[PDB]
Amino acid sequence: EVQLVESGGGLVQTGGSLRLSCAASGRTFNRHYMGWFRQVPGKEREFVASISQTGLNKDYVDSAKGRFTISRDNAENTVYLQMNNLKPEDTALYYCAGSQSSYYDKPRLLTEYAYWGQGTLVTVS
Amino acid sequence: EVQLVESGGGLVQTGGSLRLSCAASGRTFNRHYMGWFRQVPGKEREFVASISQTGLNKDYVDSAKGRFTISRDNAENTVYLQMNNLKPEDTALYYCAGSQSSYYDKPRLLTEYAYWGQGTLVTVS
Amino acid sequence: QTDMSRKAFVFPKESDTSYVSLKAPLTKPLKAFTVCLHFYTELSSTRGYSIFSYATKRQDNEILIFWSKDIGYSFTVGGSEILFEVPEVTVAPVHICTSWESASGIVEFWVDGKPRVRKSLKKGYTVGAEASIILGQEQDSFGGNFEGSQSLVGDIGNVNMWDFVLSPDEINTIYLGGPFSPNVLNWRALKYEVQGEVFTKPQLWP
Amino acid sequence: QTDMSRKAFVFPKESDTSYVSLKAPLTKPLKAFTVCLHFYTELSSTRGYSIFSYATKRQDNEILIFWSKDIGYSFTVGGSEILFEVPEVTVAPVHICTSWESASGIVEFWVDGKPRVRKSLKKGYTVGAEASIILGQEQDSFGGNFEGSQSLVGDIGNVNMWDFVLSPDEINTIYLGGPFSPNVLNWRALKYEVQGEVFTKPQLWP
Amino acid sequence: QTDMSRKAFVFPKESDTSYVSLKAPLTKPLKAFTVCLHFYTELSSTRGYSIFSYATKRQDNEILIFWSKDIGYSFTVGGSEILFEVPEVTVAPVHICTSWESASGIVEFWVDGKPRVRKSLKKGYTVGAEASIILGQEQDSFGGNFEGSQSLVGDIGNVNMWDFVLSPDEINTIYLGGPFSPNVLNWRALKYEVQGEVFTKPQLWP
């Protein structure tokens, strides 16, 4: 039921950092897991990362581990995705998705997710 | 005590579909059963269908069964009547009525019903 | 027959294929009966679900006890329905015994041993014998069409059904666990057919 | 006579013709009385209803025990009324004993063996014995003119009425169920006539 | 081995170095277990705290029982998580027993003897036997990596954990304090090592 918005996009030279943020409108934020997905022109969305309702569990894609970090602040109900060592290829649209008001593990699919944000653009020069 | 309003009427060619909707103003809506009735110039109203408060038991007229579907959404407190394979004779006024603040089965009369909406017009070309 | 005593079925994950099929030796049609059961679940503060589904070939909803969200216990026979409202929902195993008689249309509803006011239903109706009884799914057809939004997640046991109305004393004995003799469905001689993700475990409730 | 012990009447539908007529051997007019009865219904939160109706050819409301919505218990004698407010209500079988004395005009009101403050009502009056007593309806005439909005749905039993004031001890014994000898209306020697949808069933209350 | 009977550990301050490390004799990987313990703390209404941390070299959170603020008890195995809701929190000592079975996937959660609904979790997994168990700190590494916001301030005891699922009767016995024979972790025969500010004191709870 939450409404998702994203910020922190832009263009940066390779090797930079970007602390993208996603805000949620609602009161069940603490009951939904969060996820970041990637999209490119002429292709479909792509899993990036996922984060525990409790926030004690996370899941990173193979390229993202060691380079990217994901966290959440339940009090501020906002999700943060810190990206470092940005490369030219990882320049596309990014979406902050979330669903599943109830409890469960962290999947890596798309059907599960029910709510999506407008998106943001990230570019590496 | 609810106030009933209707929408979704209009004119359509034979074989089309119409998802008529009815909205209720009040908080006891979930305590009233709903019904759809038909009216034609130079005659009285006519039973069409009905929907259970809990939303598990329905009742269709002989002509409506297999062609029409009735449902209710308690959270949004709205009654939906989906008609398909419309015929030229099926062109008249339709009223969404409902009145059993209490608990009972689904009748097919007019005296029991107490509250009526303004109505809508449906036409088949 | 298998003795189910001190054991219960578990439905651990919401789905639309896990269900149990019960078989009734019933031959004559029923003019009356008394259903008693013990169930446990936390879905109350969520969508609705079906506790017991009895369906003949000519009616998917011959008898269906159903929890309606924010409303309470919804009993239906022969296509009619009455609601036994519940103000606030707790979180604990619950025992329920319900009776209906065709002569007078009187329905009795005992929740955790405390009776609800008697009301009327379908005076003169009759219930067919040949039917399908299912646990964990509301069937809108004779043996299928199970909807996902209506399946039960949780536990159920002590399911028992008679062919006549017990007196209040007998109901009190049942709620206290005393000896008794079911005649249309015996938990101690039960015969069933499990389907999907359903398991057998010791009962949680006392 | 018929012994109604362990049995009660059932009024399953809100309707205007269902009612039971009571008869009394009383001949001398009453200077005092006490009435005790158990009743159980769920209409409390929805509308008002009449528990006991005593009327004479000159007064349709000689003695009326009536539940008024959002008020409580309304006791009426000889065309005068008093209210015994109830702040909040709960769904449970309820036993009530009510006494009135002509000499002093004092009235006692016991609900669930808890006494309400004594008050005054119509000192010096006389109650005529010739009268019609009715259950399930409020009667605005000696043989008719009932109102559906006022009829009661549910159960009523243990109806007993004396011709003098019991002491608190005796009322306590009545509440717990001891032996007693009613002089005017006897549950154990009751005469009555039934009309419409009304039935006899085992009692729910303990 | 030492007998901690009638004794508990004390963590009297919020810090990121005070912790205890337990040594299990395990050699075969676990397909199932039960864990029971008694803990008392007041962090419940302010912030989160780790109760029991079990980790393997390849996973910092193979088993973690954690209290999430505003949520309740969060149980995680193999990194998959599931939460048990707790609306209001009392200030008092609490006993908890939790069971998980690999063959079938059901988790049973007993708090103060009252059982939560059964749920499915991570069917088909196997737990490694090589592992480090720590108390008072959450583990993000196999030999360090603790956090101050997650360290628990308070008292814990009765730490007991089998290699198979106890029946409801056995758990009831546990809540009574009767004799029982733990197999993998024994309070009565425990081995441990303490680091930082931690102490041994008589237990507060009964």
Sign for the CA dihedral angle at E151, E157, E162, E164 comes to negative
Q: Which has the closest alpha carbon to E133: E189, E50, E17? A: E50
Q: For the purposes of burial, counting CB atoms within 10 Å of the CB of B3, is it exposed (0-12), middle (13-18) or buried (19 or more)?
A: exposed
- Residues recorded for chain B: 125
Contact between chains at D201 and C119 (C-beta distance less than 8 A): no
* Record: contact D155-C117, CB cut-off 8 A: yes
Question: Which residues is E193 bridged to in the sheet?
Answer: E21
Q: Where are the beta strands (DSSP E) in D102-180?
A: 106-111, 114-120, 132-135, 154-162
Contact (CB<8Å) C199/E106: yes
Beta-carbon separation of C41 and E118 below 8 A: no
When CB atoms are compared, the residue of C74, C82, C122 closest to B56 is C74
User: Could you give the CA distance from residue E139 to residue E145 in angstroms, rounded to a whole number?
Assistant: 6
Residues in chain E: 206
CA distance D106 to C60: 61
- Which residues neighbour B61 within 8 Å (Cβ) at sequence distance 6 or greater? B47, B48, B49, B108
d(CA A48, CA A45): 9
List, edge to edge, every strand of the sheet that includes A3-7.
A3-7, A17-25, A78-84, A68-73
CA atoms within 13 A on the CB side of E176: 9
Structure solved using which method?
Answer: cryo-EM
Runs of H (alpha helix) within chain D? 168-176
Query: Which chains have at least 3 CB atom pairs separated by less than 8 Å from chain D?
Result: C
Residues 6+ apart with CB under 8 A from E173: E180
Fold classification of E1-206 is Jelly Rolls (2.60.120)
Backbone phi and psi for residue B96, each to the nearest 5 degrees, phi listed first = -100, 115
Interface of D with C in 42-61 (CB under 8 A): 42
Which chains neighbour A (Cβ–Cβ under 8 Å, 3 or more pairs)? E
This structure's resolution (Å) is 3.7
Q: For tokens 């500010």, what's the residue? A: E197
Chains that contact C by 3+ CB pairs under 8 Å?
B, D, E
Among chain C residues, CA nearest to E84:
C42
Residues of C in contact with E104 (CB under 8 A): 199
- Among E157, E158, E154, E160, residue whose Cα is nearest residue E198: E154
Asked if D165 contacts D108 with a C-beta cutoff of 8 angstroms, the reply is: yes
**Chain B within 8 Å of C64 (Cβ-Cβ)?**
yes
Other beta carbons less than 10 A from residue B1's beta carbon: 14
Closest partner CB to C42 (pick from E106, E117, E168):
E117
Across the C:E interface, residue pairs with CB atoms under 8 Å apart total 31
All residues at 6 or more sequence positions from D57 whose CB lies less than 8 Å from its CB, including other chains: D130, D142
* Phi, psi dihedral angles at A85 (to 5 degrees): 55, 55
**For the purposes of burial, counting CB atoms within 10 Å of the CB of A124, is it exposed (0-12), middle (13-18) or buried (19 or more)?**
middle
CA distance E17 to E151: 9
Q: Is C84 in contact with C99 (CB distance < 8 Å)?
A: no
D79: left (phi over 0), alpha (psi -120 to 50) or beta: left
Q: What span, in angstroms and rounded, lies between the C-alpha atoms of C122 and C65?
A: 16
What's the gap in Å between the CA of C83 and the closest CA on chain B?
6
| Residue D150 to residue C115: CA distance in whole angstroms | 24
DSSP symbols for E2-24? B--TTEEEEE-S--SS-EEEE--
CA distance C173 to chain B (A): 31
CB-count exposure of residue C130 (10 Å: 0-12, 13-18, 19+): exposed
Q: Would strands C132-135 and D192-195 be described as parallel, antiparallel, or unpaired? A: unpaired
Q: How many C-alpha atoms does E144 have within 13 Å on its Cβ side? A: 0
The enclosing H or E element of C170 equals: helix C168-175
d(CA E5, CA D77): 73
Tell the residue number behind the tokens 């009145």, with chain if given: B99
Instruction: Report yes or no: E68 at the A interface, CB cutoff 8 Å.
Output: yes
Closest CA to D151 of D46, D72, D75: D46
Helix (H, G, I), strand (E, B) or coil at E206: coil
* d(C-alpha B79, C-alpha B96), whole Å: 9
